[PDB]
Amino acid sequence: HPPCCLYGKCRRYPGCSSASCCQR
């Protein structure tokens, strides 16, 4: 799938899983 943080639609996926990037 993309990076974890891109387009602003929330993925907690395939080795993000430190990167929250949903949260503000």
By the 8 A CB rule, do 4 and 14 touch?
Answer: no
Report the structure determination method: NMR
> Which tokens hold the place of 2?
């993309």
* Distance (Å, whole) CA 5 – CA 13: 11
Q: How many helices (H) and strands (E) does the chain have?
A: 0, 0
Other beta carbons within 10 Å of 18: 7
> Which residue type does 11 have?
R
* Distance (Å, whole) CA 15 – CA 24: 21
By the 8 A CB rule, do 16 and 2 touch?
Answer: no
> H or E element: which one contains 9?
none
* Chain-centre distance for alpha carbon 6: 7
> Which residue type does 5 have?
C
CA atoms within 13 A on the CB side of 23: 8
